[PDB]
Each structure stands twice: as structure tokens, then as C-alpha cells.
Amino acid sequence: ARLANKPKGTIKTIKGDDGEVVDCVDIYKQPAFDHPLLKNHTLQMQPSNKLEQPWHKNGECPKGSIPIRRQVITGLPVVKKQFPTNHQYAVIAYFYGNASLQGANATINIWEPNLKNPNGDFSLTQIWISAGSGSSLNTIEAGWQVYPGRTGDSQPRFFIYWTADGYTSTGCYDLTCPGFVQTNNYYAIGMALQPSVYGGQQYELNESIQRDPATGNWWLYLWGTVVGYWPASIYNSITNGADTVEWGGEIYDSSGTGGFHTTTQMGSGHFPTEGYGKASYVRDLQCVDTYGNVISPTANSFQGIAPAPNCYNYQFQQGSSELYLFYGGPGCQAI
Ligand SMILES: *[C@@H]1O[C@H](CO)[C@@H](O[C@@H]2O[C@H](CO)[C@@H](O)[C@H](O)[C@H]2NC(C)=O)[C@H](O)[C@H]1NC(C)=O
Ligand SMILES: *[C@@H]1O[C@H](CO[C@@H]2O[C@@H](C)[C@@H](O)[C@@H](O)[C@@H]2O)[C@@H](O)[C@H](O)[C@H]1NC(C)=O
Structure with a gap:
């Protein structure tokens, strides 16, 4: 594993005790402003405890800068992002x-x-917000991912993603390409999250x-x-808005069994029927209409996408104040 070079506009570099490196980049020189379509530079400064990260122990980014995680170059290929082959969902x-x-x-x-x-697999849980289809598919994505080939380790890490052409030639993870404009001075995207404990403390x-x-x-x-x-x-x-919202898990099977014969885990690695504390979930399954109303779709209003249900699947758990989607699984043992 090697570190990438500092990005342009870096005013300070902070090194965490665990080897994480953070570059405090001038908010006006952040990668987003190198986008050919973002010549209209006007930075929207604001819209019209859990975010504190351990690297703050060794320093803070000055006002007027944003923390950007230093990319880790592992020497391993990073596969193309795909909308819900060796991907399973x-x-x-x-x-x-x-x-x-x-x-x-x-x-x-x-x-x-x-x-x-x-060295080749990944496992993630995220939201997909989209409009259009094929070459005009636009996405807004956020969630957690375990992807050592990309991140350098096996911890679940917060990520963002986007594309404006169905992943053909636009888009990237986090701030590795011009796109997303970060305004927050203390939260670095791409850092580890605290994992839940099986039969114990849950983190969201x-x-x-x-x-x-x-x-x-x-x-x-x-x-x-x-x-x-x-x-x-x-x-x-x-x-002008999105036409589709998707939630849930995904794995990438580098062993080439199409995700049908790998014990790479999705969610917690346990099937949804194990329930709260044992199987992973997504809750607050909500969207907003043009009038600003929060829509909470019922279980029967969703389409399920689980092409290897003996390995990874989902189950709704109803009866509470909100709908829970339990999802994931241990995968299927190799034959
Ligand atoms: C669920 O989505 C709603 C709608 O976007 C969020 O509510 C908005 O929250 C922002 C601040 O984050 C306010 O400026 C808006 O006025 C809120 N709108 C409404 C209708 O309440 C809400 O915060 C989200 N909830 C969770 C748990 O993520
Ligand atoms: C835009 O779409 C709105 C929502 O569509 C309806 O509800 C969703 C959940 C789907 O089931 C969809 O098939 C339904 O038609 C409509 O309420 C609204 O009228 C539409 N706006 C216009 C101008 O057509």
C-alpha cells in the first residue's frame, strides 16, 4: 500500500495515529472546481458528536479549508460502479x-x-437516488462500503458516488474526481465507521x-x-428531481461465481430473518415529493431485487412506528 500525492490547494496535512492522512484543502481549490461544467464557480456556502472523527486528536483543518482523505493506492484494480455479472444485491x-x-x-x-x-471483493450498503436510464442515468449515492482494494483496509467506510451517464465516463467515489462540492470543515469522507456488534450494540x-x-x-x-x-x-x-430511490446491500464477487457461490458477506453476514441485532437493516425509508411532503412507502409499494436469494435476501419487518428493511446474508458455500 502507498499514499497518493497531495491534491492542489492543500494548506495542511494531518496524520492520524492509525496511518490515516487528511489533507486540508482550500475550499475554493477543491477538486470539484476542476469540472468543465463547474466554471460557474459560485460556491453555495449553505443550503437555502457523530461527525467527530478520531483524526481530530492530531489536528483540525483551518477555517476556509475542507478535510479530504488521502487516497490509498493498493495496486489492486477498482471495479466499475453498477446500478442494481459478479455483483449480487x-x-x-x-x-x-x-x-x-x-x-x-x-x-x-x-x-x-x-x-x-x-483483495478483490467488496460489500456495501447504500442509497441510490436516480433519474433517467442507460447513457442518461444520473445517480446520487451514499452509504458504507468494505473494499480493501480501494480503501486499503477491511473497515466499513462512508462513501459517496455519482454518475451523469450510467457509469460510462462520468463519476467517481468520494472526492477522487471533480463533482461533489464539500462545505463541511471537520468531516472527512472515506473514513471508517464503527461496526455494530452481533447480539449487542448497534450503530447507524x-x-x-x-x-x-x-x-x-x-x-x-x-x-x-x-x-x-x-x-x-x-x-x-x-x-429537477429524481424518479427512483433504491436501498440495500450489494456485494462484488472477484472469485467469478456471479455471487452465487461465495461466503463474502452482505450486511452483517446473517440472513434477514435473524432480525434486530443480528441481521443488518435500513430504516427511515423515506422520500420527498415536489410539494415537500415526506413519503413513507409501504412494503407492497417496493420492487425487491435479490437475484441470489439462497445467498443474500431481504425481508420487511412491519408493526413498528416505521418500516424496517432487513437485508444481506452469509453467501453460499463454494461447491
Ligand atoms: C427525512 O427527510 C426529510 C425531508 O428532506 C428531512 O426533513 C427536512 O430536514 C431539513 C433539515 O435536515 C429541514 O430543513 C426540512 O425542513 C425538513 N423537512 C421536513 C418535511 O421535515 C428529515 O430530516 C429526514 N429525516 C432523517 C431521519 O433523515
Ligand atoms: C408525477 O408522479 C407522481 C407520482 O406517481 C405515482 O406514484 C408513484 C409512487 C408511482 O406508483 C407512479 O406510478 C404513480 O403514477 C404523480 O402523482 C404525479 O401526478 C406525476 N406528475 C405529473 C405531472 O404527471
Whole structure:
């Protein structure tokens, strides 16, 4: 494992005790401003405990800068992002009739699923917010991922993603390409999250994505705090709202069994029927309509996507104040 070079505009570099490196980059020289479509530079400074990270022990970024995690170059290939082959899913999808949804929430249970082939596999849980299809598919993505080939280790790490052309030539993870504009001075994207304990303490990643009606910029909130936004100018299909929201798990099987014969885990590595504390969940399954109303779709309003149900699957758990989606599994033992 090697560290990438400092990005331009770095005013200070902070080294964490565990080997993490953070570059405090001038908020006006952050990668987003190198995007050809973001020549309209006007930085929307603001929309019209859980975010504190351990690296703060060794320093803070000065005012006017943002913390950017230093990329780790492992020498291993990072596979192309794919909409819900060696990818497997346990996902639910809410399909609106037109691209007018103004936001969506996801409160995702955090785990450290085990990978059978850690140098090539990944396991994630996220939200997908999208509009359009094929070459005009636009996405807004946030969740946690275990991907040693990309991140350098096996911890679940917060990530963002986007594309404006169905992953053909636009988009990337976190701030590794120009796109997402970060406004938050203390929260670095790409850092580890605390995993839940089987039969014990549960940890959650609350994320809320909201389109600003005045600018069209899509703001990201983590546990109610602003992180930054996906500018409307990098998109086409989703500039006025989204037509689809999906939630759930995904694995990538580098062993080539199509995700049908690997014990790489999704969620907690336990099937949904094990329930709270044992199987991973997604709650706050909510979206926002054009009038600003929060929609909480019922279980029968979603389409399920679970192509290897003997390995990874999902189950709704109803009867509580809100719908829970339990998802994931241990995978299927190799034959
Ligand atoms: C669920 O989504 C709603 C709608 O976006 C969120 O509510 C908004 O929260 C922002 C601040 O984060 C306020 O400016 C808006 O006025 C709120 N709107 C409404 C209708 O309440 C809500 O915070 C999200 N909840 C969770 C748990 O993520
Ligand atoms: C835009 O779409 C709105 C929502 O669509 C309806 O509800 C979703 C959940 C799907 O089941 C979809 O098939 C339904 O049609 C409509 O309420 C609204 O009228 C639409 N707006 C216009 C101008 O057509």
C-alpha cells in the first residue's frame, strides 16, 4: 500500500495515529472546481458528536479549508460502479412516475461484513437516488462500503458516488474526481465507521439527501449536519428531481461465481430473518415529493431485487412506528 500525492490547494496535512492522512484543502481549490461544467464557480456556502472523527486528536483543518482523505493506492484494480455479472444485491426499489422526487433518507445499520477474497471483493450498503436510464442515468449515492482494494483496509467506510451517464465516463467515489462540492470543515469522507456488534450494540449511518429548490443543488446531510452538495450543473436527467430511490446491500464477487457461490458477506453476514441485532437493516425509508411532503412507502409499494436469494435476501419487518428493511446474508458455500 502507498499514499497518493497531495491534491492542489492543500494548506495542511494531518496524520492520524492509525496511518490515516487528511489533507486540508482550500475550499475554493477543491477538486470539484476542476469540472468543465463547474466554471460557474459560485460556491453555495449553505443550503437555502457523530461527525467527530478520531483524526481530530492530531489536528483540525483551518477555517476556509475542507478535510479530504488521502487516497490509498493498493495496486489492486477498482471495479466499475453498477446500478442494481459478479455483483449480487438485496435491494428494494421505489419507482416514482416522473423525475420530481426532491430527496430521500436512509438510516443504515453499520457492520463489517467479512470478505472471502479481500483483495478483490467488496460489500456495501447504500442509497441510490436516480433519474433517467442507460447513457442518461444520473445517480446520487451514499452509504458504507468494505473494499480493501480501494480503501486499503477491511473497515466499513462512508462513501459517496455519482454518475451523469450510467457509469460510462462520468463519476467517481468520494472526492477522487471533480463533482461533489464539500462545505463541511471537520468531516472527512472515506473514513471508517464503527461496526455494530452481533447480539449487542448497534450503530447507524443516518443520511439525508435534499434538492435545494432555489439552486437545484443536492445537499447531503449526515446525522442532521450538512456535508456538502452534488451540484445541479454536473447532471442532466436529475436536475429537477429524481424518479427512483433504491436501498440495500450489494456485494462484488472477484472469485467469478456471479455471487452465487461465495461466503463474502452482505450486511452483517446473517440472513434477514435473524432480525434486530443480528441481521443488518435500513430504516427511515423515506422520500420527498415536489410539494415537500415526506413519503413513507409501504412494503407492497417496493420492487425487491435479490437475484441470489439462497445467498443474500431481504425481508420487511412491519408493526413498528416505521418500516424496517432487513437485508444481506452469509453467501453460499463454494461447491
Ligand atoms: C427525512 O427527510 C426529510 C425531508 O428532506 C428531512 O426533513 C427536512 O430536514 C431539513 C433539515 O435536515 C429541514 O430543513 C426540512 O425542513 C425538513 N423537512 C421536513 C418535511 O421535515 C428529515 O430530516 C429526514 N429525516 C432523517 C431521519 O433523515
Ligand atoms: C408525477 O408522479 C407522481 C407520482 O406517481 C405515482 O406514484 C408513484 C409512487 C408511482 O406508483 C407512479 O406510478 C404513480 O403514477 C404523480 O402523482 C404525479 O401526478 C406525476 N406528475 C405529473 C405531472 O404527471
